[PDB]
Design a protein around this ligand. Structure first.
Ligand SMILES: C[C@@H]1CC[C@@]2(OC1)O[C@H]1[C@@H](O)[C@H]3[C@@H]4CC[C@H]5C[C@@H](O[C@@H]6O[C@H](CO)[C@H](O[C@@H]7O[C@H](CO)[C@@H](O)[C@H](O[C@@H]8OC[C@@H](O)[C@H](O)[C@H]8O)[C@H]7O[C@@H]7O[C@H](CO)[C@H](O)[C@H](O[C@@H]8O[C@H](CO)[C@@H](O)[C@H](O)[C@H]8O)[C@H]7O)[C@H](O)[C@H]6O)[C@H](O)C[C@]5(C)[C@H]4CC[C@]3(C)[C@H]1[C@@H]2C
Ligand SMILES: CCCCCCCC/C=C\CCCCCCCC(=O)O[C@@H](COC(=O)CCCCCCCCCCCCCCC)COP(=O)([O-])OCC[N+](C)(C)C
Ligand SMILES: CCCCCCCC/C=C\CCCCCCCC(=O)O[C@@H](COC(=O)CCCCCCCCCCCCCCC)COP(=O)([O-])OCC[N+](C)(C)C
Ligand SMILES: CCCCCCCC/C=C\CCCCCCCC(=O)O[C@@H](COC(=O)CCCCCCCCCCCCCCC)COP(=O)([O-])OCC[N+](C)(C)C
Ligand SMILES: CCCCCCCC/C=C\CCCCCCCC(=O)O[C@@H](COC(=O)CCCCCCCCCCCCCCC)COP(=O)([O-])OCC[N+](C)(C)C
Ligand SMILES: CCCCCCCC/C=C\CCCCCCCC(=O)O[C@@H](COC(=O)CCCCCCCCCCCCCCC)COP(=O)([O-])OCC[N+](C)(C)C
Ligand SMILES: CCCCCCCC/C=C\CCCCCCCC(=O)O[C@@H](COC(=O)CCCCCCCCCCCCCCC)COP(=O)([O-])OCC[N+](C)(C)C
Ligand SMILES: CCCCCCCC/C=C\CCCCCCCC(=O)O[C@@H](COC(=O)CCCCCCCCCCCCCCC)COP(=O)([O-])OCC[N+](C)(C)C
Ligand SMILES: CCCCCCCC/C=C\CCCCCCCC(=O)O[C@@H](COC(=O)CCCCCCCCCCCCCCC)COP(=O)([O-])OCC[N+](C)(C)C
Ligand SMILES: CCOc1cc(CC(=O)N[C@@H](CC(C)C)c2ccccc2N2CCCCC2)ccc1C(=O)O
Ligand SMILES: Nc1ncnc2c1ncn2[C@@H]1O[C@H](COP(=O)(O)OP(=O)(O)OP(O)(O)=S)[C@@H](O)[C@H]1O
Ligand SMILES: Nc1ncnc2c1ncn2[C@@H]1O[C@H](COP(=O)(O)OP(=O)(O)OP(O)(O)=S)[C@@H](O)[C@H]1O
Lengths: 327, 148, 592, 327
């Protein structure tokens, strides 16, 4: 069966029959940022080589039409000096676009269309150069490889915490960089049938993360347990321990967003638990241990999830049993 | 069918042998084209098999539906169920048509690919045999043999 | 070493003292520029867009511009050829002869790729880049034409005809570009039009996208590729196969046929034939045109072998015009045998793709006819009275509509095989003189013999089917009462009776197999006898011209091209009379 | 009648009688970023050509005043070599601003005001060049064309969901880039008359988006339905199915903001529904379908909105009928 989001955040949806009005390339610039680094290299080098070949074309053409490729050098003045071939023209063009300009073949005061062409060549060079500089600055500040090291426990566990069923995962920030203002959103992706007769195929219901402040935000330095209280008025209320098998239509996506501390750019790390990934009656093994003089975190036991006796039944039946024991 | 398969395989092998004897260098280019030919033939064969089985299996419901409609015609006209049955017939005949159409399209795909391989073979043979009949001693009539 | 205007008289070709624009090999250099413009404006955009599921849309003038660009690449291959041929003489390779045309080639290919990208992405404003290109390519080519005219280059030389063809084709592509900009005003305008790609292409479940591809893919069935690859990994299900487009549905074809029937009733078997004409004749004659063009371009092969072998079997250029540039003429050009080879290759490739396209269009129109006729005979079943033969109607759907559809499959052959055989006999006579007529008569004699053998084979088939049906009834008797037979061990006697019936059926199968063997042997032996009589009578009996390699092998290739239509003409005629009887029976039924 | 925001986010308001103290061009820099790409090209090229013409002016002037344009070359030393005309001066100026410097016309140790001018020319060149680089980096990171591919359903529908009237639209993110931390704000723009006698002409009342977490934020990969519960204590409470015609003073603006995943810049896509755009008694057709191995989203049926029997009356009357049926 298909899932919504892979275990590595790679979303699994396929988009079909997209009427594009040229909007995917009217944004040439974020398209040119998102081109993978080899693709960006090849676009970079194409846009330079083609420009040089173009203006070398023009230069050789002018020197032809100016009568500067005929022998008989001494009598007349070249429009730019000692262009002898399309090799000379290609080198002269390179030297004036990349501004090395050895000056062996320098433009002279002689014929204006060369002056005008050399203006044009400098200006388009400046233009494309600044365009590529900026695009690959935007590409130097891409923070995709930072969300590659924010990790989630492979198994999420439902355990009895403070007398209530709680659904927990564990997340960890491997680097020293504090991904500032981290915020976590969890949604139970499950097909929902409406009492009025509406069935939506990938319905997403946000489940509230349990916090003392009543918000969705974590201070992530040591790997921490993100848990959700399944008391009531939220999905998973009727999650029996039997319904946790492979082909059960039940997924939970988690998505944590925050700016990286260093490049100051928001990023997002996401993962998903299918009904088989989520274990019942387990609790996460402790990780932090007070070492010599610090709080040493052991990532070996990150997702071990020791099992512990929990009442195997739905949370609704748990509340019903509490109500019956009370009265 | 066995006779025609024998004749086709032997004629193809014979033509390749002739244009390799006339042109020894073509044999070097034969192996890439032979590999491409084999791959195309395999992929065709599997697709054509599936499409042929499907095209056969969708034709039985159509004739069966015609038989039924002729048998219980008075009943269907009694129920005024004529529109539903005409809809069912359009569906059956559309299934049959789409099957036959995809079958013929795979056939055309295979035949165009084989004809382009044959065109590349004739270009290689022509060019190399003409080059050898100009620079080397290669005879004039062997060039025409390999050409045909 | 590698000078554009090849180094001559101390590179005197570069001196532009004479009014630059009328220095050839500079006007030839001006052409290299617009092609560089297109290449370098486009390759970045093409590779950024090359780095979803679209349901693409066609810009109007689509097929026309594809045809034009095909012709363009053809004339550019011819121009590369005439150039490379045209500087075999001198010592330095004049690059301005072929390098500008060989550059225009890649430029035209990029043009088709870029326009296709824009078509798929429906970003019509990008077409402005082509809007420039043709202009330049027009102007610089016209400038090349005019200056040619000034030195009275004339039509005498091929290069002038090719450059005129080029000016014309660039004018055509400029007209097509402005056509596009006119219908869908994407340049600075009111920006009115949004075409909303067709509905049947948006159905997730119409996977037979043969009508919805560019003409090149329509011809190569390139889309099928994807399908077939999928069809190799996991099997083919009725979900994997799409459902038909709106253009080819039972209801669509049925309504078209009914409109044709109304038109014919406003003005019997003849009525049905004329209605089928009025309903499917456009596609039928389109397939026939493809088929006849493929026949002629296939004949273009043997004559080319003749030319090649005549050139190389001989033992071997004037008109240096542009003050140093040589100019090869049409007669020397078509007698190079290197040019002849690539022209044979191009003609062969185009002929084979036209042939396969003829086959496909005929198949599609036949299948649509089958759908329409089935729906019509069922709509007639709905209305007929209870007074009236269920199996008759069942087989009228099973075998009679089948014969009609197969007549519509082979219908282009019916019109283009006589043309094929006529032109083949004419070409053979033109090549080999009088002995070719004897050879062609000997090979034409294959068709009536094949027809007679097929008729006898069908007669033997019926005489075999009788005994086969009787043996089947006896086997069914033996198999229904196998219990009782085994209970009293009468199985051997009934098996002996079944074996006697089988021996009678084998007696008839002997005659059937003799007729099949005669068919195979005639089919493979009439051509050998034709070649034999042709050549021997050409040399000994006629005492005619000596048999040269070119002449003989051209005649052999023409015989191989003549074999197939002569063999299949019998089958075409038999299928035609069979489907005529089928339409008669269908009219008799539909009239009640 | 006028609307507040067009269907393409283009806001329709016209601002009149604006006392500007030079504040629209005291921000020359975001003005120079927001100049459309052709305008930015022309400003770029003007600011280069004018600089070259200026410093070429100065160079020719100096060489004049230094007596370097008079013939009689051999006796005295040029202040910069082989300036012969304002062409030579223009080329020398280009070569030193764009740093090609073929060196055919190089400044010599001879006369200081040239040294000082060449210092000035280099420094202003560096200054304007870095100014333009930075402005067009800021312009390479403009994310307007990204909000061009976040799409809203053309028709919003009011349907009965879970026994309550709900106002729904559907939105979709065409690209693979997850527009991180998406947040949606909806406001019912309608002229409001106050009981104390105050009528405001474009009053905007925020309507709460229905979420299980009680927030305004979506995980947008597959096109999703944004719906608002019209139970009470929010506008549209008295929205009868008859009041949904063209000239009804009622608009609903929606505005979704979030950083693009790649260039890490916040963007915003907005749209508006007038009283005729919003349909009654319809429900959005399902879009997601489980294909071969993924969740294929079909964008053909994006805004089809099949109709379904709903009680045509106001939500207040719906609550009144529930209360009457209860007692
Ligand atoms: C030796 C020298 C001399 C020259 C040469 O080499 C060097 O030697 C020549 C040699 O001789 C070669 C020919 C040998 C004979 C070959 C004959 C062959 O066609 C024959 O064989 C079948 C090939 O597929 C045809 O098609 C039938 O093939 C069978 C299935 O593949 C079925 O018998 C039937 O199926 C269909 O039957 C009809 C039903 O309605 C359908 O449901 C059903 O799918 C098909 O189709 C035929 O069925 C007929 C039934 O009456 C109909 O008329 C019509 O449909 C069609 O006909 C059949 O029709 C026909 O008999 C043709 O493809 C190629 C052919 C010509 C060869 C081409 C190349 C050459 C010429 C060679 C070459 C130049
Ligand atoms: C984006 C890229 C944009 C590219 C933009 C422009 C492209 C420019 C290409 C120019 C090609 C033609 C050159 C030409 O006209 O000749 C002229 C040069 O100039 C010279 O003409 P002339 O002076 O009359 O020649 C005689 C000289 N003589 C007297 C010494 C003999
Ligand atoms: C995609 C880009 C092509 C852009 C247009 C090419 C223009 C023609 C170049 C050419 O004429 O060949 C040049 C060689 O050098 C070459 O062969 C280079 C050919 C260009 C191919 C691209 C290489 C990158 C010829 O050199 P020349 O200009 O003829 O030299 C004349 C003077 N001389 C005769 C005294 C030597
Ligand atoms: C494009 C359509 C037609 C153009 C086809 C390409 C040119 C074919 C002719 C080659 C030629 O000029 O003869 C050469 C030999 O050449 C050979 O030995 C045969 C080479 C044929 C294919 C080589 C290119 C493969 C890619 C002469 O030596
Ligand atoms: C990532 C980087 C990618 C860069 C991409 C491409 C590099 C582009 C520059 C390559 C050198 C070009 C040289 C040129 O233009 O003229 C020269 C032609 O020299 C040639 O023989 C090749 C010219 C065509 C090259 C076409 C692209 C090849 C890649 C001049 O030739 P010559 O001296 O007159 O005589 C022949 C010289 N020889 C004897 C050595 C054969
Ligand atoms: C973009 C590319 C597009 C490609 C599309 C079409 C190209 C069409 C190629 C065929 C052209 C016909 C001319 C020909 O092939 O003969 C030439 C060889 O051929 C070559 O040397 C060039 C080979 C093809 C290179 C194409 C690059 C342009 C030589 O002809 P010849 O003079 O008879 O030779 C006799 C030998 N002798 C001179 C030593 C005696
Ligand atoms: C366009 C592509 C290149 C075409 C070159 C055609 C040259 C024309 C030619 O006659 O061939 C020449 C070689 O020169 C070659 O044939 C070189 C072939 C290299 C093929 C490069 C393909 C690039 C794609 C043939 O040599 P030649 O010495 O010029 O023969 C005539 C001189 N003679 C009569 C005294 C013997
Ligand atoms: C490009 C864009 C357009 C593409 C269109 C057409 C393609 C280019 C057309 C010209 C190709 C060469 C033509 C030619 O005369 O070949 C010459 C060889 O010299 C070469 O063959 C140089 C080969 C260049 C290598 C780069 C090819 C890739 C492009 C023939 O030899 P020669 O000159 O008689 O002298 C031989 C002695 N020498 C080898 C020591 C010098
Ligand atoms: C922002 C742009 C800011 C632009 C900033 C400054 C603009 C500078 C413009 C200078 C114009 C006057 C030049 C001048 O005074 O002449 C002096 C050069 O200097 C030369 O004076 P001199 O040496 O007395 O001449 C005699 C030399 N002789 C002895 C060889 C004959
Ligand atoms: C070339 C085979 O592709 C077809 C081609 C067609 C149309 C067609 O002009 N056929 C010619 C054969 C070709 C080689 C001339 C023909 C003519 C007369 C009798 C039978 C036949 N034949 C048709 C059945 C198979 C071959 C003998 C239809 C259907 C097909 C198909 O893919 O089934
Ligand atoms: N027509 C206008 N265009 C632009 N800004 C305005 C305009 N009217 C007022 N403002 C600004 O709005 C602020 C307060 O507006 P008002 O109270 O209406 O006028 P004001 O504050 O009395 O004008 P000042 O402070 O004496 S210059 C001031 O800081 C003005 O800069
Ligand atoms: N298949 C699709 N691919 C991309 N965008 C789409 C697609 N279908 C609809 N849209 C966009 O979604 C918005 C509204 O969707 P729909 O209501 O379903 O179609 P629509 O609005 O009637 O199309 P328009 O506005 O007449 S061009 C439009 O602005 C479209 O640009």
């Amino acid at each position: 069966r298909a899932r919504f989001v892979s275990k590595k955040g790679n979303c699994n949806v396929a988009h079909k029959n997209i009427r594009e009005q040229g909007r995917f390339l009217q944004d040439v610039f974020t398209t040119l940022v998102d081109l993978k680094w080899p693709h960006t290299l090849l676009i970079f080098t194409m846009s330079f080589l083609c420009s040089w070949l173009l203006f070398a074309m023009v230069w050789w053409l002018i020197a032809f039409a100016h009568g500067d490729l005929a022998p008989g050098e001494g009598t007349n003045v070249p429009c730019v000096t000692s262009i002898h071939s399309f090799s000379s023209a290609f080198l002269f063009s390179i030297e004036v676009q990349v501004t090395i300009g050895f000056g062996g073949r320098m433009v002279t005061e002689e014929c204006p269309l060369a002056i005008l062409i050399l203006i044009v060549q400098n200006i388009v060079g400046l233009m494309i150069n600044a365009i590529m500089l900026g695009c690959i600055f935007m590409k130097t500040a891409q923070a995709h490889r930072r969300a590659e090291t924010l990790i989630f426990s492979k198994h999420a566990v439902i355990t009895l915490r403070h007398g209530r069923l709680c659904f927990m995962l564990r997340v960890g920030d491997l680097r020293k960089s504090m991904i500032i203002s981290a915020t976590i959103h969890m949604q139970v992706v499950r097909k929902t049938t409406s009492p009025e007769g509406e069935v939506v195929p990938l319905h997403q219901v946000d489940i509230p993360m349990e916090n003392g402040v009543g918000g969705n935000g974590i201070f992530l330095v040591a790997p921490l347990i993100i848990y959700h209280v399944i008391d009531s008025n939220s999905p998973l209320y009727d999650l029996a321990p039997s319904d946790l098998h492979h082909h059960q239509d039940l997924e939970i996506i988690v998505i944590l967003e925050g700016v990286v501390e260093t490049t100051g750019i928001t990023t997002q790390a996401r993962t998903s638990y299918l009904a088989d990934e989520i274990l019942w009656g387990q609790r996460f093994v402790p990780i932090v241990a007070e070492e010599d003089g610090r709080y040493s975190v052991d990532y070996s036991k990150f997702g071990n999830t020791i099992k512990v006796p929990t009442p195997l039944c739905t949370a609704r039946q748990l509340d019903e049993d509490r109500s019956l024991l009370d009265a | 069918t066995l006779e025609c398969l024998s004749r086709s395989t032997l004629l193809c092998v014979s033509a390749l042998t002739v244009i390799s004897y006339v042109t020894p260098v073509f044999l070097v280019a034969l192996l890439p084209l032979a590999v491409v030919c084999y791959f195309i033939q395999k992929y065709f064969r599997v697709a054509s098999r599936d499409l042929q089985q499907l095209d056969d299996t969708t034709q039985l419901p159509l004739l069966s539906h015609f038989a039924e409609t002729v048998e219980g015609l008075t009943t269907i006209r009694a129920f005024r169920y004529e529109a539903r049955f005409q809809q069912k017939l359009l569906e059956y005949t559309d299934s049959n048509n789409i099957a036959s159409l995809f079958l013929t399209a795979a056939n055309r795909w295979l035949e165009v690919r084989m004809e382009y391989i044959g065109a590349c073979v004739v270009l290689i043979a022509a060019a190399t045999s003409i080059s050898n009949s100009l620079h080397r001693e290669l005879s004039a009539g062997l060039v025409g043999l390999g050409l045909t | 070493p590698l000078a554009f205007c090849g180094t001559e008289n101390h590179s005197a070709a570069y001196r532009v003292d004479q009014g630059v624009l009328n220095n050839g090999c500079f006007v030839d250099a001006l052409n290299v520029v617009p092609h560089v413009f297109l290449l370098f404006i486009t390759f970045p955009i093409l590779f950024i867009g090359w780095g979803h599921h679209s349901t693409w849309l066609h810009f109007p003038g689509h097929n026309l511009r594809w045809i034009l660009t095909f012709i363009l690449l053809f004339v550019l291959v011819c121009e590369i050829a005439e150039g490379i041929l045209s500087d075999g003489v001198t010592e330095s390779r004049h690059l301005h002869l072929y390098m500008p045309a060989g550059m225009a080639f890649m430029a035209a290919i990029t043009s088709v790729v870029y326009y296709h990208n824009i078509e798929t992405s429906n970003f019509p404003k990008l077409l402005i880049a082509l809007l420039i290109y043709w202009t330049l390519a027009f102007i610089t080519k016209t400038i090349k034409f005019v200056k040619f005219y000034d030195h009275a280059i004339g039509f005498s030389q091929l290069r002038f005809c090719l450059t005129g063809l080029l000016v014309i084709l660039y004018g055509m592509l400029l007209l097509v570009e402005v056509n596009v900009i006119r219908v869908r005003r994407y340049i600075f305008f009111k920006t009115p039009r949004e075409v909303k790609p067709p509905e049947d292409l948006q159905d997730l479940g119409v996977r037979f996208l043969q009508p919805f591809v560019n003409l090149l893919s329509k011809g190569t069935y390139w889309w099928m590729n994807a399908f077939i690859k999928t069809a190799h990994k996991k099997p083919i299900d009725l979900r994997a196969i799409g459902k038909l487009p709106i253009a080819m549905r039972a209801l669509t074809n049925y309504q078209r046929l009914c409109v044709a029937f109304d038109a014919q009733a406003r003005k019997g078997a003849r009525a049905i034939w004329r209605a089928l004409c009025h309903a499917f004749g456009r596609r039928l004659i389109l397939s026939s045109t493809f088929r006849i063009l493929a026949d002629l371009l296939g004949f273009a092969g043997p004559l080319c072998i003749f030319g090649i072998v005549d050139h190389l079997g001989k033992e071997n250029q004037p008109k240096t015009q542009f003050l140093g540039v040589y100019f090869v003429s049409s007669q020397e050009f078509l007698g190079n045998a290197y040019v002849l080879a690539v022209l044979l290759f191009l003609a062969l490739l185009l002929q084979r793709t036209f042939l396969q396209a003829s086959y496909y269009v005929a198949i599609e129109t036949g299948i649509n006819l089958r759908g329409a006729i089935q729906t019509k005979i069922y709509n007639k079943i709905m209305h007929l009275s209870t007074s009236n033969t269920a199996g008759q109607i069942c087989n009228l759907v099973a075998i009679d509509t089948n014969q009609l559809m197969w007549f519509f499959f082979l219908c282009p052959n019916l019109w283009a095989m006589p043309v094929q055989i006529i032109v083949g006999v004419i070409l053979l006579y033109y090549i080999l003189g009088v002995s070719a007529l004897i050879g062609a008569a000997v090979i034409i004699l294959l068709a009536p013999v094949q027809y007679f053998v097929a008729t006898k084979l069908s007669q033997a088939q019926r005489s075999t089917l009788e005994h086969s049906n009787e043996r089947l009834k006896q086997t069914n008797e033996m198999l229904r009462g196998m219990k009782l037979l085994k209970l009293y061990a009468w199985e051997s006697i009934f098996c002996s009776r079944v074996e006697v019936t089988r021996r009678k059926e084998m007696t008839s199968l002997r005659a059937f197999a003799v007729y099949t063997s005669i068919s195979i042997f005639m089919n493979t032996a009439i051509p050998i006898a034709a070649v034999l009589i042709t050549f021997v009578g050409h040399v000994s009996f006629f005492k005619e011209s000596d048999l040269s390699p070119s002449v003989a092998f051209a005649s052999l290739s023409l015989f191989h091209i003549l074999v197939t239509p002569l063999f299949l003409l019998s089958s075409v005629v038999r299928s035609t009379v069979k489907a005529l009887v089928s339409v008669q029976k269908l009219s008799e039924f539909l009239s009640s």
